[PDB]
Amino acid sequence: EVQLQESGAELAKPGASVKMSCKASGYTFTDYWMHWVKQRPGQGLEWIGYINPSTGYTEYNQKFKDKATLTADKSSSTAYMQLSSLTSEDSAVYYCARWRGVYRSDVHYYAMDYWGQGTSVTVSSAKTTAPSVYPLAPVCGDTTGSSVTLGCLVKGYFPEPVTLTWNSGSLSSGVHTFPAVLQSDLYTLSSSVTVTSSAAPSQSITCNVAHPASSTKVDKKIEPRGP
Amino acid sequence: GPNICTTRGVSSCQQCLAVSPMCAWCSDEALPLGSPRCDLKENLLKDNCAPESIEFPVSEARVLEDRPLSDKGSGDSSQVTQVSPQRIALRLRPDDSKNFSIQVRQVEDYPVDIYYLMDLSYSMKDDLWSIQNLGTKLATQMRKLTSNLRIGFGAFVDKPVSPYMYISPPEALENPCYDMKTTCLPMFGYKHVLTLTDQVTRFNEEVKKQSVSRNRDAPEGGFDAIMQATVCDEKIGWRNDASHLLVFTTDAKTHIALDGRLAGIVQPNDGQCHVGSDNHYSASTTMDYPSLGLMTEKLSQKNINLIFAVTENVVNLYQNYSELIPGTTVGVLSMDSSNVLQLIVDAYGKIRSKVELEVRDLPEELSLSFNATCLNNEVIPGLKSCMGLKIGDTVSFSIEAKVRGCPQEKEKSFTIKPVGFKDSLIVQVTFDCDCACQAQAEPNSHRCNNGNGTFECGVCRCGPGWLGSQCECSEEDYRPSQQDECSPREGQPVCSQRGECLCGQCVCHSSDFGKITGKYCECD
Amino acid sequence: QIVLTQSPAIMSASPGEKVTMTCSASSSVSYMHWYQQKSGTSPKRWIYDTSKLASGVPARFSGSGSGTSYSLTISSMEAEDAATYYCQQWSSKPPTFGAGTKLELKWADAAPTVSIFPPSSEQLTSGGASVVCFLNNFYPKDINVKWKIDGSERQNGVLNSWTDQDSKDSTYSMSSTLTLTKDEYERHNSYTCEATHKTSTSPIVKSFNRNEC
Amino acid sequence: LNLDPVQLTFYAGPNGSQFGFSLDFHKDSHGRVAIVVGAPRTLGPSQEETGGVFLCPWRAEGGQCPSLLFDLRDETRNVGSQTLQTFKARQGLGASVVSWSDVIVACAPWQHWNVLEKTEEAEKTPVGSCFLAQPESGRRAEYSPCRGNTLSRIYVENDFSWDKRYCEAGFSSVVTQAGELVLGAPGGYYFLGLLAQAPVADIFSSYRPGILLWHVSSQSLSFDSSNPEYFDGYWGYSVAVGEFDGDLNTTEYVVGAPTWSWTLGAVEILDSYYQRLHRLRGEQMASYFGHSVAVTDVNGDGRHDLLVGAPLYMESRADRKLAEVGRVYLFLQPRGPHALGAPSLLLTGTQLYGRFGSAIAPLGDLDRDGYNDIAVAAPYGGPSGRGQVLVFLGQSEGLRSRPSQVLDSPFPTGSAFGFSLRGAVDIDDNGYPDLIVGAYGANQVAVYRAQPVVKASVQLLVQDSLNPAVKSCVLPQTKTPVSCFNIQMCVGATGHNIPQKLSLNAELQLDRQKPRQGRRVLLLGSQQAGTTLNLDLGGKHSPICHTTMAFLRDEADFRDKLSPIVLSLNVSLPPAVVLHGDTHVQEQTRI
Ligand SMILES: [Ca+2]
Ligand SMILES: [Ca+2]
Ligand SMILES: [Ca+2]
Ligand SMILES: [Ca+2]
Ligand SMILES: [Ca+2]
Ligand SMILES: [Ca+2]
Ligand SMILES: [Mg+2]
């Protein structure tokens, strides 16, 4: 087997509508129902709605109602959810969960099982920009020892599903990535690589940053600052 | 709190609806495994059930036609109305009753059709002398009661076969009155003489050309003539917007069904039209006599008012016959029929006074009760008739219909119709025994323990072998078991002595104080 | 709606210890399920009807209790069980989830490694400047950072970024970024980032001088 | 109860001949049972309808029957100055066939007779006749008691007194067991009705061929009455004979007058001299009471009971106050000189215009249970409208109000299935009396054969009490002390002429009252509360007995300790014979 696959991240402007999909592979897709569960970025899993794939019985949750309409497609075996009248407070991850029958834990009907990977929904009115990349070399006046560190800032971009690595993943040791912070309605993260004093600057270390929302890939080489 | 619906039907939607009219079913399927799905609507709203997923049909009596009752039948562009409402759509859930009212009014100055059936055996000869001026004398008398009169004529003696008629000598077939000085017509069974005509002098013209016959036996077969005057509408000329009177005059007994076997005639009368283009009952010597039930049914279907205008020596007999044919009248006729006009007028008055209802095509699952709101306001419970009315007076009837069980067909129809009136009320009955969630039932579902039952309306419904919320355990070897763990401690009683243990799972019994829940039924 | 409150919000234990979590309902729910969600946002199923282990669960996790307060117990905890556990009721008809309990790992104290980086030439030609201080491999996670510009503390334009516990050595990393206009950056020579931790009373001070190479 | 409706025999006759209008059995000298059937419209010599009689032998497949030859030519004689003529066109021969010993009497009700003397005539009237035949020896004879020579003027001047011209003798014929023929003439005495009795031997011996007018020495005709009730009564529409006064030397005729006293109806139980003993009046006007009368002993006390039919009776429904369905009345004869009072049972039909009760046939002991039965016919009944025959069984209080069997018509619409019935004779020698039903619309006779019946006897033996304190049994594959007991069950089958291949299913159930979840005791073989077994009884005159092992559950498992335990045994046939008798047995025990 049972695999549920969800769609990728969706950027939506306020007042618009979203088309979430959950494609189910395995079992029958007519004998198990489908939920939808919202997860805010401050914990708290909220039940949203409901659907029986054979007949569209859409029971909804605590004051959701028209804020989420659930539909199903038994031909392609895929369950959809439509969020209407989006607001800045609806920026959370939406999961699709199955529903264990046969046993269903005696009386507690809920078992869920087989959650989707989670589709982050980002809500904003601004447009997507190309990020700016700044490399960092160590301070000349700082006393050196048997260890050196290099940095890479990515600043001024819009929603951040990214994968940052050094030398295209050739060096996966001593790599630290930090969650992007929000400021000026734009995102900013930093990345650090720590190596020995013999690895750098003897060898070449390159920071790679790829943004799969603007189709921009930037590679920058870390070099010591001049006089 | 607790009610009848709470502890009567908890197995299916149809069982929930059949318990009582007030029951409701919450087919919401996000409810936990096992819930009070079947109970009243108010507490289903209290049970956090979805307002869109509540099955609660309400029986109603919806009127479809309510044309106003007419004031005069004069002008009559086929638009006179005597029963309102005219069509009603009734919707009844099972074991429930619905009531509706109808109003019947005899519109003033209604056109009338009179068909004079006259026995014409030999003892009925002097009558032919006192009828020759009935067309002019009845038109003057019945002109004040109606503005459109049409009058016809008929005749009959008896079947012309074997022991009824004379067949010897050969000169007696041409005229049966051979031995007597006079001569009579060859004997006939029924001949239609004059079709219903607006011109009145045609009755005088076509009744002065008649002559009597002669048969052997004393009874005369006039029931055949009544049947043929009833079922042959197109030949006779019966109107549809008129009052049909059939004035049947005789002075002897009558032959009933199975009395024809003495002539070798055994084929039952089928009640069809056999009068040919020669104006003669053709199948007279081949079909039996009509019984009383068939004759009554054909009179009822064609809206005929029958008036036995018979002589004294037989009046009692026909009185006892008039108690088996509803809608008829008996009158006393002189020897020479010198008073048949006054008999006709009085019998018309007696037909027009009373108002009686009859029910047609009523099916076996419906029962009806009437309350007649007659003159003034004095309801007369159980009565579906009024007497002593006048012309123009209206009566009301309150009807209550009850249904026992769920009928197989959810679309029936019946008729409430005053006897002798064209206008009728048509009820179209629809039975709401099946809820909408049973149409999309999914069988062999994984939701009923791997296809061990059907999953409709949110409840597993499985047959023999399995039972439970989702048909979990089998009863083949469930009685002997060590699964007695249904309480926290071994010394404690099962379900706190407040519920029943099924396959190691406590189910709480119903309580009048309130709802009982919990794993060990320790809640309230 | 039934409200579920998990009393321990943040926990920590050494490998080879007993751990208990409590989820106390509000309306006497029968049965209570527990879901495990790791770092990566995908909560699996872990326990159903409050005493039965779903397939794949080891034989170390147990559930016990009834009525209004249920509990989940872990015995001999390794480094493989460090996630957030949520409780579900579904005995009413809102199925409500618990707030969740975070579980951590105890390890040895490690002094943070403090480094400082000035703005780049590209950022200087861009119109501004950004000075950052990075802290690597500190334990415990509660640390303090401070920025000083030419001997004066700055409380504006400072952004701090934390890190989640890694699955290899259970360390943490700190990032402190200060962005200021290039004209103001060129008006100041010395900058300093200071880190205060419980490992030593004296804070670690890293100072650099602008245009010193 | 045991009439076979799948395997039938059909006898068919000429098209349009009304074959099967009237039928009977016929036992020759050797004991073979052939059938006699009537056909009142079969073509004669001149291609004109003169009826006929067909003597069908018994063949298990059916088919075409031969025909008995009767004189079918007009006769004329010249005696003195008078000329006597008999007219046989459309005479309706075969309209009523009866059989006594080896003599078949087929009666032509509508045969005409006329006397000419110069100009005066006696008119042409349907006096009727009855042709008697002895097939094996070939003798032929004729009987007609209503043939006279009086001229018409004498009748006119005598106010039509003793006017037997319209007799229609042979309308309904019955032969008494002493050898005397009784003919009902509903038209005699100017449509009053009469009856004529004469010995068969005297009819045969006094027949001189070619003499049209003669009189039997020992004949005796009924009298006329001037009571206005009797007028147009059709007295003699149907006759029967029996014993209704406690003296075995005399015979008591039972006659029906369906149009008696202004279309009311009556049935009179006269005696051998036509003196009344009792009269049963009808219930409803024009219901045609007395159309069919039967005399059979339907309660097994030795005294004959009467049954009367009213085909056109209108019962009172709910929505419609009258609905023509038909009716049958049963009058049980009381002891001593008591008079036959109110009806002891009223049977009513269901289908509208069904003409229920228009043919009643005493079937005799259909299933050898000791009490005689009847079969009533509804020629136009049944949901389809093609006909029905309802078989009613006899009990000590009369008849069962519910038909033990209903036979539907195998013929198309309009056949009038059941207009004539016969029973109480065994035609294939299998020990049980059969039935033959006529359908003259379809010109066929259908023979229903009675199937052997099986009396089943069941015995259930169990201990009168149980002691949970004493344990002597252990569950299979385990070790648990439980209280146990044996249950004995015995099944047997009996009957006359029973097939050698017979088997029955016995269902044994424990704890009848409690639900399946609350069954205390179970079985020690498969831990079940019930079982179903098969028993083969082929040739077993002694019952088969088997003993099963049962055990009680734990003391703590059940809470009830006062409600008695009930065990039941039920026997049924497997899914050739009909099983009736003691099939359900219940026995209770309690700690
Ligand atoms: Ca007269
Ligand atoms: Ca007549
Ligand atoms: Ca006697
Ligand atoms: Ca008796
Ligand atoms: Ca019997
Ligand atoms: Ca037989
Ligand atoms: Mg007359």
Side-chain angles (χ1 to χ4, degrees), chain D residues 36-59:
Chain D
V36 172
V37 197
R41 294 276 156 260
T42 298
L43 301 163
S46 304
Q47 317 283 0
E48 189 148 29
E49 312 145 9
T50 65
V53 76
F54 297 93
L55 181 58
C56 308
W58 167 241
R59 295 165 301 242

Side-chain angles (χ1 to χ4, degrees), chain B residues 50-68:
Chain B
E52 173 156 70
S53 179
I54 291 186
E55 319 277 350
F56 183 53
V58 173
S59 303
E60 96 283 359
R62 162 167 176 77
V63 77
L64 301 194
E65 299 191 52
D66 196 18
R67 288 198 294 291

Side-chain angles (χ1 to χ4, degrees), chain B residues 379-390:
Chain B
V379 85
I380 310 176
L383 207 60
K384 56 167 181 178
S385 61
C386 271
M387 325 217 316
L389 287 84
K390 294 192 331 303

Side-chain angles (χ1 to χ4, degrees), chain B residues 422-438:
Chain B
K422 163 200 169 181
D423 297 280
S424 61
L425 184 141
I426 293 132
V427 187
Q428 307 173 344
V429 152
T430 285
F431 296 111
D432 264 323
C433 48
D434 165 56
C435 49
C437 57
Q438 294 197 184

